[PDB]
Amino acid sequence: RTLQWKCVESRRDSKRLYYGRFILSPLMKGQADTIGIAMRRALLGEIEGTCITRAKSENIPHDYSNIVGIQESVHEILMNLNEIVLKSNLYGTRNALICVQGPGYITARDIILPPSVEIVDNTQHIATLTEPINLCIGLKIERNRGYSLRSYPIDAVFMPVQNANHSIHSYGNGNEKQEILFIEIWTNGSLTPKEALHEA
């Protein structure tokens, strides 16, 4: 092909931060920016993501009060659940559980997911248990885009592309003034940069 793209670089700084730079070359003048801006807006806004949207501690002392034998408050564990990264392709509403029954660290690896969801980083700490409590919590997971607004709601955001950039460079044809586009994508491991570029 004349017009060609390649994955010029990729990195995996963590299970929760991939990076990828892509090239697309022999673009014509004014094509590269029309591509770049639309692709940026697609990546940053029109990519969908999967995350936990609701939590239900199966024993609740009070809606706002502390929880016994956990080394941090219900709010800290709800924030740690907010930071969970999920990999699902199927839309719709889904459910999950944590049932950890002793002292130790509860982590994303301990989440019992439905068949259609995958943990992106098993190692993500969720909660510290000092006491041998049969801590059971239900979770409800949704796939959507952007953001959305008794069991706790989680103020989670469905945006797996963590950042994106593009640069436009003269290819140097003195008449046709062709151009090179570079795109850069940082993502949660919910998508690889290439998969986010395709879905965008």
Partner: peptide
């Protein structure tokens, strides 16, 4: 619309092995 689609399809180009 068609020219936009012609700009974005290139990212879905697979190439032969």
């Amino acid at each position: 619309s068609r020219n936009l689609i012609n700009l974005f399809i290139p990212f879905l180009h697979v190439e032969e092995e």
